[PDB]
Each structure stands twice: as structure tokens, then as C-alpha cells.
Paper text:
The native [name]-1 envelope ([name]) spike is a heavily glycosylated trimer of gp120–gp41 heterodimers, which mediates viral attachment and entry. By docking and mutagenesis studies, we previously demonstrated that certain antibodies to the CD4 supersite, such as VRC03 and VRC06, establish functionally relevant quaternary interaction with two neighboring gp120 protomers in the [name]-1 [name] trimer, while others appear to make contact with a single gp120 protomer.
Unlike VRC03 and VRC06, the more potent VRC01-class bNAbs such as VRC01, VRC07 and N6 appear to interact primarily, if not exclusively, with a single gp120 protomer and possess shorter [name] loops that marginally contribute to antigen binding. Based on these premises, in the present study we rationally designed an [name]-loop grafting strategy in an attempt to confer on several potent CD4-BS bNAbs the ability to interact with additional target epitopes on a neighboring protomer of gp120. While the binding footprints of both chimeric antibodies on the first gp120 protomer are nearly identical to those of the original antibodies, the [name] loop-contact surface is mainly located on the neighboring protomer, indicating that the elongated [name] loop establishes quaternary contacts without affecting the “classic” interaction. Besides contacting CD4-BS2, mostly through residue K207, the [name] loop seems to bind residues with long side chains at the base of the V3 loop: the aromatic Y318 and the positively charged R304 and R308. Mutations to alanine had generally less pronounced effects than charge inversions, suggesting a dominant role of electrostatic interactions; however, simultaneous alanine mutation of R304 and R308 yielded a pronounced loss of neutralization, particularly for chimeric N6. A strong association restricted to N6 was aa 276, an N-glycosylation site, where an asparagine was highly associated with improved neutralization, while an aspartic acid that impaired glycosylation had the opposite effect. Likewise, our results showed that N6, which naturally has a tyrosine at position 54, is mildly autoreactive. In particular, N6 and VRC07, which in their unaltered form were mildly reactive in the ANA test, lost all detectable reactivity after chimerization, while VRC07-523-LS, which was clearly ANA-reactive in the unaltered form, showed only mild reactivity after chimerization.
Numbering used by the authors:
A (entry chain L): 7 to 67, 67A, 67B, 67C, 68 to 95, 95A, 95B, 95C, ...
B (entry chain G): 128 to 135, 151 to 184, 188 to 309, 312 to 321, 321A, 322 to 398, 411 to 458, 465
C (entry chain G): 184, 188 to 223
D (entry chain H): 1 to 82, 82A, 82B, 82C, 83 to 100, 100A, 100B, 100C, ...
Amino acid sequence: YVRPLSVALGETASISCGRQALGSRAVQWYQHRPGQAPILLIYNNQDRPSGIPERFSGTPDINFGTRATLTISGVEAGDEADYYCHMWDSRSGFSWSFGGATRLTVLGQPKAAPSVTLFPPSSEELQANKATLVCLISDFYPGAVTVAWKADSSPVKAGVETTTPSKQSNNKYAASSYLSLTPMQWKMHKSYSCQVTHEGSTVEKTVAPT
Amino acid sequence: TLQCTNVTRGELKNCSFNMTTELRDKKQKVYSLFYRLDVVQINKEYRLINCNTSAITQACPKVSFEPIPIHYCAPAGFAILKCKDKKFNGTGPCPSVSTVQCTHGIKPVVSTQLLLNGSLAEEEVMIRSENITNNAKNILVQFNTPVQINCTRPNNNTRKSIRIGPGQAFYATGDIIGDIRQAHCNVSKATWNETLGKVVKQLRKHFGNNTIIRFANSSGGDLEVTTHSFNCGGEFFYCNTSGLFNSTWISNNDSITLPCRIKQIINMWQRIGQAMYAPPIQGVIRCVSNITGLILTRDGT
Amino acid sequence: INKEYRLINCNTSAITQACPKVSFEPIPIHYCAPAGF
Amino acid sequence: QVQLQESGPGLVKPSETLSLTCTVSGGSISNYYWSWIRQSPGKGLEWIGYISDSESTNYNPSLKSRVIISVDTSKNQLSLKLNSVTAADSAIYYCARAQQGKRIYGMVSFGEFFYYYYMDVWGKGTTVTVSSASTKGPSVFPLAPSGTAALGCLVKDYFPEPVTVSWNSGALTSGVHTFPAVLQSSGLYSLSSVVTVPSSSLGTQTYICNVNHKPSNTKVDKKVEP
Ligand SMILES: *[C@@H]1O[C@H](CO)[C@@H](O[C@@H]2O[C@H](CO)[C@@H](O[C@@H]3O[C@H](CO[C@H]4O[C@H](CO[C@H]5O[C@H](CO)[C@@H](O)[C@H](O)[C@@H]5O[C@H]5O[C@H](CO)[C@@H](O)[C@H](O)[C@@H]5O)[C@@H](O)[C@H](O[C@H]5O[C@H](CO)[C@@H](O)[C@H](O)[C@@H]5O)[C@@H]4O)[C@@H](O)[C@H](O[C@H]4O[C@H](CO)[C@@H](O)[C@H](O)[C@@H]4O[C@H]4O[C@H](CO)[C@@H](O)[C@H](O)[C@@H]4O[C@H]4O[C@H](CO)[C@@H](O)[C@H](O)[C@@H]4O)[C@@H]3O)[C@H](O)[C@H]2NC(C)=O)[C@H](O)[C@H]1NC(C)=O
Ligand SMILES: *[C@@H]1O[C@H](CO)[C@@H](O[C@@H]2O[C@H](CO)[C@@H](O[C@@H]3O[C@H](CO[C@H]4O[C@H](CO)[C@@H](O)[C@H](O)[C@@H]4O)[C@@H](O)[C@H](O[C@H]4O[C@H](CO)[C@@H](O)[C@H](O)[C@@H]4O)[C@@H]3O)[C@H](O)[C@H]2NC(C)=O)[C@H](O)[C@H]1NC(C)=O
Ligand SMILES: *[C@@H]1O[C@H](CO)[C@@H](O[C@@H]2O[C@H](CO)[C@@H](O[C@@H]3O[C@H](CO[C@H]4O[C@H](CO)[C@@H](O)[C@H](O)[C@@H]4O)[C@@H](O)[C@H](O)[C@@H]3O)[C@H](O)[C@H]2NC(C)=O)[C@H](O)[C@H]1NC(C)=O
Ligand SMILES: *[C@@H]1O[C@H](CO)[C@@H](O[C@@H]2O[C@H](CO)[C@@H](O)[C@H](O)[C@H]2NC(C)=O)[C@H](O)[C@H]1NC(C)=O
Ligand SMILES: *[C@@H]1O[C@H](CO)[C@@H](O[C@@H]2O[C@H](CO)[C@@H](O)[C@H](O)[C@H]2NC(C)=O)[C@H](O)[C@H]1NC(C)=O
Ligand SMILES: *[C@@H]1O[C@H](CO)[C@@H](O[C@@H]2O[C@H](CO)[C@@H](O)[C@H](O)[C@H]2NC(C)=O)[C@H](O)[C@H]1NC(C)=O
Ligand SMILES: *[C@@H]1O[C@H](CO)[C@@H](O[C@@H]2O[C@H](CO)[C@@H](O)[C@H](O)[C@H]2NC(C)=O)[C@H](O)[C@H]1NC(C)=O
Ligand SMILES: *[C@@H]1O[C@H](CO)[C@@H](O[C@@H]2O[C@H](CO)[C@@H](O)[C@H](O)[C@H]2NC(C)=O)[C@H](O)[C@H]1NC(C)=O
Ligand SMILES: *[C@@H]1O[C@H](CO)[C@@H](O[C@@H]2O[C@H](CO)[C@@H](O)[C@H](O)[C@H]2NC(C)=O)[C@H](O)[C@H]1NC(C)=O
Ligand SMILES: *[C@@H]1O[C@H](CO)[C@@H](O[C@@H]2O[C@H](CO)[C@@H](O)[C@H](O)[C@H]2NC(C)=O)[C@H](O)[C@H]1NC(C)=O
Ligand SMILES: *[C@@H]1O[C@H](CO)[C@@H](O)[C@H](O)[C@H]1NC(C)=O
Ligand SMILES: *[C@@H]1O[C@H](CO)[C@@H](O)[C@H](O)[C@H]1NC(C)=O
Ligand SMILES: *[C@@H]1O[C@H](CO)[C@@H](O)[C@H](O)[C@H]1NC(C)=O
């Protein structure tokens, strides 16, 4: 399961390990952004691989008792991922599973507003007896938006699918939004909108059949 | 009846048992750790080693097993005579004699095979026996230079008080804090090589300047004699000595390691019907002592 | 711990009942020094 | 240095053999330990098993009764054959090189050490989906634009994940923006890419989005123009 942790931008992160050791330990730390390759941060209790910032530091066991904690100083927005504690020690056997995914969320990031781009049905799919509006939303933070479709001025609510806000490489979020229509429903209307409410404000983008 | 399990090779156990409380009508299921040498079978069911032979008395955990220098004195009207002969073997007429009222500081060290913390020999290393031709006479060789031995049980043990009755407390081994390791001893392989060379030099003076002198380990008996049996910090060690006596001598950093085991149910002497539980010692035990003598036993090239 | 009770000493010490023939009466005691004192 | 790349069916029917492969680049296969790690949606990183430089088998007991990690040294390639697959086996499977560390705490002579394994370099990943539903190629529909302008491609009903989108075979890479997919109630993902483009070059330069869907062996292109 997941352990929540919240730090502020540019502060120090104290990720405590899930399972504290019984004897002499060799703890591996892993950073995992969901849907991506895990990144080894610290393999020996204090040793880091080639290409890891100094701001990542693990506690070595010089004396017994001191628990293993991952220390992230000057936390960036990119340091938002799951952090696993791979705990081996002399008393427990062969630790097959990784740690408990600590989900570090960084607070105080720049609040950026979305970028709506609505496309009409293409001529090919219209010639294929199927219409599809696509309302592309991107570069918004915090990553959570609510989409509202409108045929002219009336709500639609029927036949709409929307992505969950996935994260971008620029540490902002993006989400698609498709409204499936019949080729005649899209022709019998004057306009179609995509109200995109992010945080506490809406952004309208309308598209008409001409 | 004890319910024991291995502790997470397979030497020290983890046993639980229904125990009497401070009320005569209440039981309690407490657990404790016991070494292998203290338990025998019938979760697997175990039992203390002494239960089918003798009662057991837990040593008071305030008295110390530390050898304090003891002086034996003769009463008024008597006297003690010392021997100032730096090469005085066991018997014979001591040329230089002096009278004392009390003996020197004698540490009552209960040891085995290796004479610990004893007094040295001046001039050269001495060797004594009643009839050295009689192989049933233990040879009491006493060094002139001490070879140092360091012993330690590295497990950070914990003591757990268990109220077994009104004013009756059984001190048990709670659990190990940290690593589980091996109890052992170290001697310098160099200082033990030259000390065995001095011993082997005096062994030819009555066995032959050409015959070979060989060293082997024990050939049988009990744990108290087949191993270096002593006390360290309050717990009774039993150290394998095959790594020290494995050398054959002809007419003409270094470290040896001795795998010691630890036992708590000990009959101090050959006492029949009496056993003692040594309470566990908290912390990490390590003691530094000199082996100054030796007790050999020739075979009978 | 009807209500449940217990002797006050049970969690600290064993208890010995005084022999009911010996008397707690202060008898005059005389302390004497040995010969030579 | 050393890099790895996985490849596999991407879609395996339930109760079957989930074959997988991973070719490593820039290193010898027979002097490093290799480990398989999968990460299911919602669950955590699960260690499948690992093979040594001596080609020794040792699997997670959670699976084991279904895993058999092989390795062919003629190439730099080793496999992974999870069989009797069920619904919960859908995950992103990763190919990582494990290195062995010998953590000594007491005496090496008595055996007072223990071996720990750490993966330092990883494979990019291979999405595997388990479902009785057959595969299906998509169908690219072009999104025509209208200082700055934006155009893209609609990749309608396909199954299963993923699809790769390249613009001008790889030439157009700045300003590109591919969006995550959308699973419709019919049971098919619909993805859409879009490229922000300077307005003056709309009528001159040509744009072609290259959509590939591997489970269907389909390679399709399309043009975008007002
Ligand atoms: C009686 O007699 C007994 C027997 O005669 C005798 O027993 C001895 O007991 C002592 C104490 O109990 C034992 O000492 C321990 O030794 C352990 C092993 O140390 C050896 O190995 C390590 C690692 O070796 C690998 O790595 C180095 C590079 O680091 C390479 O150069 C090596 O070649 C090797 O790498 C190859 O081999 C691996 C296989 O092992 C392969 O997997 C690998 O791929 C490679 O092929 C060495 O670092 C040691 O070097 C030290 O020794 C030389 C002399 O040889 C010294 O000059 C110098 O000081 C060197 O430092 C050595 O060779 C140690 O692991 C152990 O210390 C650790 O553990 C304890 C308890 O767990 C910790 O409290 C302690 O702090 C140490 O932890 C550090 O290291 C671990 C592991 O790396 C880290 O995870 C941890 O975070 C911590 O790191 C911190 O310190 C580091 C420096 O140490 C530092 O770099 C970090 O940044 C961080 O600050 C302990 O010392 C000894 O082994 C027994 N003897 C024998 C023969 O077993 C007894 O003492 C006698 N006396 C009595 C009983 O009174
Ligand atoms: C020798 O043998 C004895 C057994 O006779 C051992 O003593 C037991 O040791 C185990 C651990 O090895 C103990 O189990 C632990 O109990 C803790 C107490 O939690 C209890 O109480 C809470 C109420 O606060 C309940 O909610 C809970 O359910 C428990 O009933 C737990 O905190 C521990 O939980 C850990 O493990 C679980 C699952 O593995 C994890 O999910 C947790 O996150 C956590 O990490 C654990 O359950 C047990 O209580 C001990 N028994 C007694 C009687 O003390 C000795 O340890 C052993 N010694 C040696 C040296 O071998
Ligand atoms: C052979 O003789 C040796 C010395 O004559 C014996 O070594 C002695 O062993 C005992 C028990 O193992 C030690 O007593 C322990 O002392 C420590 C603390 O000591 C330290 O702190 C005091 C401060 O008061 C300081 O004065 C000391 O010098 C130490 O720095 C306690 O924690 C223990 O509970 C216990 O009391 C002796 O200290 C130790 N003496 C020396 C000089 O090392 C050895 O055990 C003998 N061997 C045999 C087989 O009998
Ligand atoms: C503790 O571990 C030892 C070591 O494996 C166990 O010894 C085994 O005991 C069984 C009897 O139950 C024998 O059949 C095996 O041959 C033994 N193996 C070895 C290597 O000696 C012992 O049983 C374990 N004890 C407990 C309580 O788990
Ligand atoms: C008490 O029980 C112990 C169990 O260890 C007995 O000692 C063992 O006895 C068997 C057979 O009698 C021997 O094969 C073992 O070698 C003995 N082991 C040891 C360590 O002595 C002991 O004889 C029993 N004592 C009594 C009085 O019954
Ligand atoms: C172990 O070694 C020597 C005895 O051989 C002792 O250390 C010497 O002790 C004498 C008298 O006690 C001193 O005159 C020397 O100066 C000491 N030498 C050193 C280097 O310290 C030591 O006390 C012995 N330990 C015992 C007998 O427990
Ligand atoms: C052995 O373990 C005990 C704990 O079981 C250690 O005692 C601790 O010592 C630290 C000081 O470094 C104190 O802050 C703790 O409160 C102590 N704990 C207890 C329970 O008393 C002791 O340091 C360990 N010793 C060794 C040599 O490992
Ligand atoms: C036994 O232990 C003693 C002390 O723990 C060791 O003596 C130390 O030796 C080192 C290396 O020569 C010196 O730097 C120290 O100063 C010594 N300690 C003291 C108090 O003098 C001794 O070497 C050990 N011997 C063995 C065989 O393990
Ligand atoms: C003391 O240590 C020696 C080795 O240092 C042990 O010798 C073993 O003896 C058994 C027979 O009982 C053999 O099967 C092993 O091969 C021997 N081991 C070695 C390394 O030679 C001896 O057993 C130990 N003493 C005790 C009482 O166990
Ligand atoms: C035995 O039980 C008595 C119960 O009276 C304990 O004494 C009381 O302890 C509590 C808290 O420990 C105090 O608040 C009371 O003031 C104590 N009363 C008296 C009269 O002492 C006593 O501490 C217990 N003893 C042990 C060793 O556990
Ligand atoms: C304690 O007594 C109960 C009574 O039935 C029994 O079930 C239990 O196994 C006993 N425990 C031990 C450790 O003997
Ligand atoms: C000790 O020396 C005397 C005379 O030097 C000798 O008679 C005696 O046999 C010696 N002791 C032993 C055990 O040989
Ligand atoms: C003595 O040594 C022999 C061979 O080295 C071994 O078989 C035997 O178990 C040893 N005995 C003791 C008591 O160490």
C-alpha cells in the first residue's frame, strides 16, 4: 500500500523506511514514477550510483539502532514519485518484496492554468458515419480538472469520456476529453463548447460546423 | 514442557512456557531464549537438561564470578615456606627457602586445558609432573612469557525479569538486540607459535633430542574437558581448541580463532544432584586474559 | 485488581507468618562487655 | 555503457504462456546478474525472479510455480516465461541488471554475512495486457488547424495499449505533445497527438503523423491540411 508524505519546494525530505532492520542492514532506495522505469538512488546504505544528485543521501549503519531514512534536500517538483525501501538484514531471510511505496508530494509548486484545444470531427470519420470532438487540456497544475460539454447552451453529459490528469515532463498535468457524436447530431447544432474548470475558474473553447 | 523454535546454525532457541505468576492460581505464557546445551526434546517440545537428574538453583545476580586474589595464611604457631628456586621443578630439595605467613595473591580461576590469569615462571618455561613416564599424570607446564587470548560473545543480549512467585524472579534471556554472531577467542598465531616452541624445547630434555613431539586435540570426555572451559564476564564458555594443538615438531597480523559455545545449566564440579542456572549477562561480553600455563596429556613418536 | 483483592506483599516479597508462641514483649536486655574490656 | 530493451506479445490470452524477451546492449550477458520486475496498476513493484552470471534459477515464491527465466548467450538476450496467466498479471514488465553485494557484519570465516542484490540499469518497459478479447488496429483521423497554430491526429478505437506516434518519421519533434489514452465503454483506447506549429509554415511545410500499433502489426500515416 501507499504511505502519504508532503514536503515543500526547496525543503528537506525525511522518508523513513517501512520495515526497520533487526540486525546489520543493507538498504536499497528506489525512485519510481508510475508508468516509468524505476531509478536506483542508493544501493549500499549510504552509497549512491553514478548520476544521482548529492541532495539524495541515505543513513549508514555505523552503530546499530539508527533506522534507515532517505534524505532529499532541496526537493524539486520532479522529486514527486514513489520511493521504496529495499531492506535486507542478517536476521530476516531473503527480502523478495520492495518497501512500502512512499508517495512524496511536493507542496507550493507554481499554479499554472490549462491550455484547451478543441478539434472538430475530421472529414474522414464524418465520411465514415461517426463524429468525435476532442478537447485537449494540458499544462495545468494542480492536476485535477472538471470538463463540461455544451451543445449550443445545453449540457450534454451523455457519451463523454475524459482522461485522468496525467503528469507531463514539465511537472504539470494534462488530460484529453472526447465527446462521441453521430454525424447528424453534430450537424443539427449551431455550436459545441468545452468548459474546462481548473481550480476555481473555467475556460471555454467553442467549435462550430462550418 | 517448553515450546521452542529456532531464532531467525540453529544453536540458540526461543522457548515459551506456561509459568506460575505471583498469584498461586494464575498462569502466564512467557517466552525466553535458551542455548542448545540447556534443552532436550521429548513447534517442537523441549525441557531443561537438568530436570531428569537434579534440581536447579539460579545464581544470585549480585555476586560476581571474578577471581579475587586470595591469600592463604597459617595460624599462629605454624608457618609457610616458599621456594626461591627460579628453576624449581615439582619436587626435590629447594636450595633457597624463605618463610611467609600468607601466600601471594592467588586468583581462584576455574579453567580447563589453558591456565588463565595465573602466575608466570621466571627464567625459562617450566614443566612438572609426578612421573613424566606415567602417561596418566597430567603434565603441568607453566609458561615464562604470556600468550594473550581475547574472548567475546558478541551478541547484545537482554535480561528479562519473570516473577515466578512472591519475591521469586527468574532472570531470562529476553531477545538479542542486533546481529547474531559466534562466540570465539583469539590468540596471536606468532606468540602461540613461539610459546609452543619453548614448551617443545623443554619436552625433549626427558623424551629425547631426536623423537618427534606432536600436538593433537582432545580424544573424548565431557564438554568441560574436551574444550577450553572457563568464565568470561559471567557466562561460561566452552572453546574448541583444535586450532591450537595441531602441530608436529621435528628434531630440528596473525590470529587463531576458537569456536566457543555457551551454556547456562552447569554443574560447577562433578557434583551429583546439584545444578546451577547462570543468569544472562546484558550487553556485549568481552574479556582479556593471559594463558600462562597448560595441562597436557601424552599418549604413549 | 464481590470485588477481587490480593495481599499487599504478593507483588514484592514472600511472607512469613510469625510463630504464635513467641512474644513481642520488650524484655529487659543487658549488654555486657567481655573480659578485658 | 549498458542498456536494455524488452519486447513481447503485449497481449496474451488468459490461461496461456506469457513469453517475453530482453536484449541488452553494450555488455556481456554471462557476467552479470539479471532480474525481472513487474509493476501492476495500483499494486507495487513485484520482483519476479533473477538469474546469475552462473545461470542459476531463483524465483519469488509468490510466483515460482509459473516462472522459468531462461537465457541464451549466443545473443545478449534472456527470456521470461510466465504461464497459466490470469487477469491480475497485467503489468509493465521491466528488465534490470542486478549486481551482487556481500554485506559482511561479523566474521567471513563463520559465515557472518548475507548477499543483497541491487538493480542499477533498467529496461524501458513492455506493457502486457491479459484479456480474451482479440486485438484490433486503430484508425488515424487527421485534425486540421485553423502567430501560432495547432494540429494533430486522432487515433480512434484500438486495443490494447500502447500506440507510438511519430511526426515526419521523427523529424518533427519540437512542440509535439502526445496525450494519454482514453478507454471507452466499448473497451477500446482512443489516443490523440497534437503538434504546436508556427502559423506561417502551415501552407508550406508538410506534416505526417506516424502511428504504429504493434499488437496489430499496423503502420499507418495521414496528412493534415486546412
Ligand atoms: C578475532 O579474530 C577474528 C578473525 O580473525 C576477527 O574477526 C573480524 O571481526 C571484525 C569485526 O567484527 C570484522 O570486521 C568487519 O569486516 C567487514 C568486512 O570488511 C572487509 O570487506 C569490506 C568490503 O569489501 C568489499 O568492498 C571493498 C570496497 O569497499 C573492496 O575493496 C573489497 O575488495 C570488497 O569488494 C569485493 O568483494 C565483495 C565480496 O565481499 C564483492 O561482492 C565485490 O563485488 C568486490 O568483488 C572492506 O571495506 C573492508 O576493508 C577494510 O579492511 C581493511 C583491511 O582489510 C582496512 O585497512 C580498512 O579499514 C578497510 O575499511 C574489509 O576488507 C565490514 O563490512 C565490517 O564493517 C561494517 O559492518 C559493521 C557492522 O555491520 C558496521 O558497523 C561498520 O560501520 C561497517 O559498515 C560499513 O560498511 C558497510 C558495508 O560496506 C556499509 O553498508 C555501511 O553503511 C558502513 O559504511 C560506512 O563505512 C564505510 C567504511 O567501512 C564507508 O566507506 C561508508 O561511506 C560508510 O561511512 C567490519 O569492519 C572482520 O571482517 C573479521 N575478520 C574476518 C576475517 O572475518 C576479530 O576482529 C578478532 N578480534 C576480536 C574478536 O576481538
Ligand atoms: C521469540 O518468540 C516470541 C514469541 O513467543 C517472539 O515474540 C513475538 O514477536 C513477534 C514479532 O516477531 C510479535 O509480533 C508483533 O506484535 C506487535 C504488537 O502488535 C500487537 O498488538 C497490537 C495492538 O497495539 C495489535 O493491533 C496487533 O495486531 C498485534 O496483536 C506488532 O506491532 C507486530 O506487527 C508487525 O508485523 C505485522 C505483520 O508481520 C506488520 O504488518 C506490522 O506493520 C508490524 O511490522 C508483530 O505482529 C509478537 O507480539 C511477540 N509476542 C510476544 C508474546 O511478545 C519474540 O520476538 C522471539 N524472539 C526472538 C529473538 O526470536
Ligand atoms: C583475567 O583478568 C582480567 C583482568 O585482571 C579480567 O578482565 C576483567 O574482566 C571483568 C569482567 O569481564 C571486567 O569487569 C567489567 O568491567 C566493566 C567496566 O569496566 C570499565 O569501566 C571501569 C569503570 O569503573 C574501568 O575502571 C575499567 O578499567 C573498564 O574501563 C563492566 O561493564 C562489567 O560489568 C565488569 O564489571 C574487568 O574490567 C576486566 N579487567 C581488565 C583489566 O580488563 C579477565 O576477565 C580475567 N579472565 C578470567 C578468565 O578470569
Ligand atoms: C533449527 O534448524 C536446524 C537446521 O536446519 C533444524 O535441524 C533439522 O532438524 C530436522 C528434524 O526436525 C532434521 O530432519 C534435519 O536433518 C535437521 N537439519 C540440519 C541441517 O541439521 C532444526 O530442526 C530446526 N529447529 C526448529 C525448532 O526449527
Ligand atoms: C537424563 O536425560 C539425558 C538426556 O540427554 C540422559 O543423557 C543421555 O542418555 C542417553 C541414553 O541414556 C545417551 O545415549 C546420551 O548420550 C546421554 N546424553 C548425555 C548428554 O548424557 C541422561 O542419562 C538422563 N539421566 C537420567 C538419570 O535418567
Ligand atoms: C597479562 O600480562 C602481564 C603479565 O605477564 C601483565 O602486564 C604486566 O604486569 C606486570 C605486573 O602486573 C607489570 O609490571 C608490567 O608492566 C605489565 N606489562 C604491561 C605491558 O602492561 C598483565 O597484567 C597480565 N594480566 C593478567 C595477569 O590478568
Ligand atoms: C545493546 O543494546 C542496548 C539496547 O538493548 C543498547 O542500549 C541503548 O544505548 C543507547 C545509548 O547508545 C541508549 O540511548 C538506549 O536507550 C539504550 N537502550 C536500552 C534499551 O537501554 C546498547 O547500547 C547496546 N550495546 C551494544 C554494544 O550494542
Ligand atoms: C587483544 O586485545 C587487546 C586490547 O583489546 C589488543 O591490544 C591492542 O593491540 C593494538 C594493536 O597492536 C594496539 O593498538 C592497542 O593499543 C592494544 N591495546 C592495549 C590496551 O594495549 C591485542 O592485540 C589483542 N590480541 C589478540 C590476539 O586479539
Ligand atoms: C573443533 O573444530 C574441528 C575443526 O576445527 C572440528 O573438526 C570436525 O570434526 C568432524 C568429526 O566430528 C569432521 O566431520 C569435520 O570435517 C571436522 N571439521 C574440520 C574443519 O576439520 C571438531 O568437530 C570441533 N569440535 C567439536 C566438539 O565439534
Ligand atoms: C506492588 O503494588 C503496589 C500497589 O499498591 C505498588 O504500590 C503503588 O504503586 C503505584 C504506582 O506504581 C503508586 O501510585 C502507589 O502510590 C503505590 N502505593 C504504595 C502503597 O506503595 C508497588 O509499587 C508494587 N510494587 C512492585 C515492585 O511492582
Ligand atoms: C498452556 O496451557 C494451555 C491449556 O490448554 C495449553 O493449551 C497451552 O498449549 C499451554 N502452553 C504451553 C506453552 O505449554
Ligand atoms: C626435579 O629435580 C630433581 C633434581 O634435580 C630430580 O630428582 C627430579 O626427578 C625432578 N623432577 C622431575 C619431575 O623429574
Ligand atoms: C578433534 O579433531 C578431529 C580431527 O581434526 C575431529 O574429528 C574431532 O571432532 C575433534 N574433537 C574435538 C573435541 O575437538
